[PDB]
Design a protein around this ligand. Structure first.
Ligand SMILES: Cc1c(NC(=O)c2ccc(C(C)(C)C)cc2)cccc1-c1cn(C)c(=O)c(Nc2ccc(C(=O)N3CCOCC3)cc2)n1
Length: 264
């Protein structure tokens, strides 16, 4: 969907991301949207435009929808669903003292539903983390910016030794071989559950990226957050098998989470 930029009203600055400026606005004076203004040089644009239909056709209640693009001008725009509560990582830290454990599990379920959908579509997120989940006005968590890491033009982000590469969310085979698969998203999802249950702490805080890489390659795993039951920790820990083929699918994780909910 090529959106007519005349149909967009910019209303508020939402900050800056790895493509530059993002704004809150309305489409046809009614629907809230977020608008990424793709900073020139920041994205592999012809690759993106060439491949974006698959990403727009991803449709699920727990994905932050890509509604369309504006490509007949520069900078190009990516128009998405608007999420009033911003990123999950901040939401966790801001409301840290208010969450009940049932709500944390619900958040895990939301993310797991989105990822099971993506898995079913053989579509990789590649940068799953609380910072890449957003929260709407009703506390529903949704997965954002799935697939976009592929188009990033920034050596600090694209190199596994870059300062921006999501090392703390990456399995050994990504760190060593750049081998992304369903099972590297699984690993990241485990780390995301850990961010949720730790109420937004940084994974491997006080370790550098390279120290993190070194020690996880040797078997170091994130400790159980105080708020995680042993059953919940078992679920997140299952995502961290050194060998990719020993990790669960998102279908299995979803069943695991639903079982805990029913037990609860
Ligand atoms: C996704 C995003 C980025 N980041 C990126 O664009 C980005 C680009 C590429 C990547 C890859 C690395 C994966 C390629 C990652 C991220 C940067 C800035 C804003 C948003 C964003 C988006 N949406 C769709 C919202 O609904 C929303 N909503 C907000 C709502 C509220 C607030 C806010 O200021 N709040 C929250 C409520 O309490 C008051 C303070 C902030 C944002 N904020």
């Amino acid at each position: 969907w090529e959106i007519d930029p005349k149909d967009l009203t910019f209303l508020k600055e939402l900050g800056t991301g790895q493509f530059g400026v993002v704004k809150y606005g309305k489409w046809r004076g009614q629907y809230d949207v977020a608008i990424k203004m793709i900073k020139e040089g920041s994205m592999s644009e012809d690759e993106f435009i060439e491949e974006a239909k698959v990403m727009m056709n991803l449709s699920h209640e727990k994905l932050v929808q890509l509604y369309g693009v504006c490509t007949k001008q520069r900078p190009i725009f990516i128009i998405t669903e608007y999420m009033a509560n911003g990123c999950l990582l901040n939401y966790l830290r801001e409301m840290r003292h208010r969450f009940q454990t049932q709500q944390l599990l619900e958040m895990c379920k939301d993310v797991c539903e989105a990822m099971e959908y993506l898995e079913s579509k053989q579509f990789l997120h590649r940068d799953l983390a609380a910072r890449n989940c957003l929260v709407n006005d009703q506390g529903v968590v949704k997965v954002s910016d799935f697939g976009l890491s592929r188009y990033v033009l920034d050596d600090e982000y694209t190199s596994s030794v870059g300062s921006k590469f999501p090392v703390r969310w990456s399995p050994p085979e990504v760190l060593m071989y750049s081998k992304f698969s369903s099972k590297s998203d699984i690993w990241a999802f485990g780390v995301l559950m850990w961010e949720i249950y730790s109420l937004g702490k940084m994974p491997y805080e006080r370790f550098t990226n390279s120290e993190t890489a070194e020690h996880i390659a040797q078997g170091l795993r994130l400790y159980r957050p105080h708020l995680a039951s042993e059953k919940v920790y078992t679920i997140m820990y299952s995502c961290w098998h050194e060998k990719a083929d020993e990790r669960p699918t998102f279908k299995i994780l979803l069943s695991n989470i639903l079982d805990v909910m029913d037990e609860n």
